[PDB]
Structures are given as structure tokens and as C-alpha cells.
Amino acid sequence: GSAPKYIEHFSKFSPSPLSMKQFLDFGNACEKTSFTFLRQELPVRLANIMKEINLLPDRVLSTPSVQLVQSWYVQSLLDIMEFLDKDPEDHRTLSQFTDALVTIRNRHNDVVPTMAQGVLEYKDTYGDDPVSNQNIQYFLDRFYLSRISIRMLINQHTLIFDPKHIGSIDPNCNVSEVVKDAYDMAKLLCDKYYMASPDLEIQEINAANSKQPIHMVYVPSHLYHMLFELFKNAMRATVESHESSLILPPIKVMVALGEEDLSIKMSDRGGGVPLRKIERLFSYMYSTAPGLPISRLYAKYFQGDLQLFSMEGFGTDAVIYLKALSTDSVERLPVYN
Numbered sequence: 001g002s003a004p005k006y007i008e009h010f011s012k013f014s015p016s017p018l019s020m021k022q023f024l025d026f027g028n029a030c031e032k033t034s035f036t037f038l039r040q041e042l043p044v045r046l047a048n049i050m051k052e053i054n055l056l057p058d059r060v061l062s063t064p065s066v067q068l069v070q071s072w073y074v075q076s077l078l079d080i081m082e083f084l085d086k087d088p089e090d091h092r093t094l095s096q097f098t099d100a101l102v103t104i105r106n107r108h109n110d111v112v113p114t115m116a117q118g119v120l121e122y123k124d125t126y127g128d129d130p131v132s133n134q135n136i137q138y139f140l141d142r143f144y145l146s147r148i149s150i151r152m153l154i155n156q157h158t159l160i161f162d163p164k165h166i167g168s169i170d171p172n173c174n175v176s177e178v179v180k181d182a183y184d185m186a187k188l189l190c191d192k193y194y195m196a197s198p199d200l201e202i203q204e205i206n207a208a209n210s211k212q213p214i215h216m217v218y219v220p221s222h223l224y225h226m227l228f229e230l231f232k233n234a235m236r237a238t239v240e241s242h243e244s245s246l247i248l249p250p251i252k253v254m255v256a257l258g259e260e261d262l263s264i265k266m267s268d269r270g271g272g273v274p275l276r277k278i279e280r281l282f283s284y285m286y287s288t289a290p291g292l293p294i295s296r297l298y299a300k301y302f303q304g305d306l307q308l309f310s311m312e313g314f315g316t317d318a319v320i321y322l323k324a325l326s327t328d329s330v331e332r333l334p335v336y337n
């Protein structure tokens with residue numbers, strides 16, 4: 001096989017950050033453009049991250065968990081080679097490719113629980129010192145980011161080439177609606193496991209159009225994933241702090257739209273978290289026993305971020321920061337150096 005020389009040639013190239021605007025303009029600006037493009041860009045982004053995997057020490061590199069995904073990436077890389085020589089125009093050369101993408105998405109579905117079981121066997125084999133933390137944390141933020149960037153291209157392709165929504169993108173994303181959806185769903189999960197559930201106050205704030213409901217251009221899939229996780233905590237927290245009590249304070253969410261920042265605060269009153277312990281809530285390692293950090297990545301992905309400020313003995317605040325503009329909204333891709 002040539003896979004390591006393939007990795008070699010394509011780890012030369014750089015991932016190409018796309019905007020929302022570009023993602024949309026594919027709308028269709030046609031399959032053949034999407035094909036000719038992706039059959040370069042995927043290899044590039046696969047190659048790039050696979051080059052980084054290979055830079056891990058043998059004590060990590062050797063472990064079952066790693067080699068397994070390292071394998072998947074190869075099998076995937078290879079699958080996309082097949083289409084380098086093939087010319088578009090042929091409606092069947094395009095068809096077989098879409099299939100190829102689907103099979104690859106579905107091959108990679110377990111990356112998360114898998115990487116986890118590698119972390120875990122590391123903590124027990126080698127230990128949980130802070131330096132191990134920074135390394136794991138450095139790498140996985142990048143790995144998992146890279147991972148997201150790839151899913152994004154793949155869904156974009158398959159969902160279009162099978163109109164209001166444009167694949168995983170809503171150009172008219174009513175944010176509050178997504179917020180209810182994530183809440184309702186969390187409420188369901190909460191009630192089920194707890195027989196109660198704090199209510200939800202939402203309040204919009206439209207800087208410019210002081211009155212108008214807040215539409216934005218996003219991948220609502222991603223926005224849900226994040227909101228959902230945040231609620232899960234806001235509820236778990238709110239409940240356990242007040243199980244000996246009667247009255248269950250709601251979960252206030254605020255949505256602010258400014259000149260560039262669309263911000264979402266999820267205030268709970270769950271007896272909060274002392275500052276010392278906050279960094280840890282984003283640590284892949286220090287939260288492996290046998291969430292947020294991934295939700296954080298999803299934010300950073302289109303140039304946003306996700307922060308916690310709690311007040312030990314009151315409650316936590318959790319802000320999702322999104323760029324307000326299709327123009328300022330570009331992929332954050334981990335890149336080689």
C-alpha cells in the first residue's frame with residue numbers, strides 16, 4: 001500500500017477554511033464542483049490529522065483504541081483515492097462517491113467512545129498527571145475539531161445531492177425555537193430520571209431591531225448538540241442542590257444579538273462551582289470514570305466560543321458566543337506546522 005506516501009503528499013496541502021456564505025452558495029452551484037473539490041479537500045484534512053496521530057509517542061500510538069481509528073482514517077482516505085482519476089460528468093461516478101461518503105461517515109460513528117477507552121487505558125497504565133492532561137487536551141481538541149470539519153463537508157454533500165434549508169445549514173435559524181427544542185428534550189430526560197424539572201424563561205435582546213425575533217445563519221444540528229448538553233447540566237445541578245428543598249428555580253436563558261456577537265447565556269441557580277474546579281469541567285481526562293469540551297469545539301468551529309462563569313453557592317452561567325454574520329463565520333480548522 002501507498003497510504004503513508006498518500007498521507008505524505010496530502011499532508012503537504014492545507015485544509016481550506018470555508019465560510020457559511022461559501023457553504024450556502026453551493027446551494028445548486030452543482031455536484032461536479034462539490035465532487036472535484038471534496039475529492040481533494042477530504043484527503044488533505046484526513047492526511048493532515050493522520051500525520052498528527054503518527055506524531056504521538058509509541059506508548060499512545062501502540063494502544064488498540066488508537067490503531068483502530070488510525071485504520072478507519074486509512075480505509076477512508078483510500079476509498080476517496082478511487083475517485084481521483086475518475087472524471088465527473090458521469091452521473092454514476094458521482095453516485096458511487098456519495099455512497100463512499102455515507103459508508104465513511106458510518107464507519108467513523110464510534111470515534112468518540114473509542115478515543116475515550118484509549119484515554120481510560122492511559123489513566124490506569126501511565127496515570128493522570130497534569131502534563132498528560134495538557135497533551136490529551138491539546139490533541140483531542142484538534143482531533144475532534146478536524147473530525148467535525150469532515151462531518152460538515154460530508155453531510156453538506158449527501159444532504160443536498162440526494163429549497164428552504166441548505167443541508168445542515170438553516171439560513172433563517174430561529175434561535176429561541178432551537179432553545180425550546182433542546183429544553184423540552186432535556187425536560188423529558190430530566191422528569192424521567194427525577195420526577196421534576198425546572199421551567200424555562202427565555203428573553204431575546206435585539207441590539208438594533210429592539211423588537212424583532214432573532215434569526216441567524218447556523219448549523220442548527222450543532223446549536224442543539226450544545227444547548228442540549230448545557231441544559232442537561234443546568235437541570236442535573238438545579239435538582240440536586242434543591243432536592244431537600246421544594247421550590248425549583250427556573251432556568252433563565254438570554255439571547256443577545258450585537259453588531260458581531262450573538263451570545264446565549266444559560267443561567268441556572270444550582271449552587272454553582274468554585275473557580276478552581278472549572279478548567280477540569282472541560283478536561284477530557286478528568287471527566288473519564290468507568291460533553292462540554294466537544295460542545296465547546298462545536299462553538300469554536302465557526303469562530304465562536306463557550307465559557308462558564310459560576311458563583312460558588314448560587315448558580316452557574318454558561319454562554320455560547322456565535323459570530324452574528326455569515327461573513328465573520330468561517331471554519332476554525334486545526335492545521336499542521
Ligand SMILES: COc1cc2c(cc1OC)[C@H](c1cccnc1)N(C(=O)c1ccc(O)cc1O)CC2
Nearest residue numbers: 230233234237240241268270271272273277316318
Ligand atoms: C467537580 O466539582 C463540581 C462540578 C460541578 C458542580 C460542583 C462541583 O463541586 C462543588 C456544580 C454542581 C453540581 C451539583 C449540584 N449543583 C452544582 N455544577 C454546576 O454548577 C454547573 C456546571 C456546568 C453547567 O453547564 C451548569 C452548572 O450549573 C456542575 C459541575
Ligand SMILES: CC(C)c1ccc(COc2ccc(CC(=O)NCCN)cc2Cl)cc1
Nearest residue numbers: 056057060115118119122132135136139140
Ligand atoms: C487516547 C488519546 C486521546 C491519547 C491518550 C494519551 C495521550 C498522552 O499524550 C502525551 C503525554 C505525554 C507526552 C510527553 C512526550 O513524550 N512528549 C513528546 C511529544 N512531542 C506526550 C504525549 Cl502525546 C495522548 C492522546
Ligand SMILES: [Mg+2]
Nearest residue numbers: 306307308309
Ligand atoms: Mg471558561
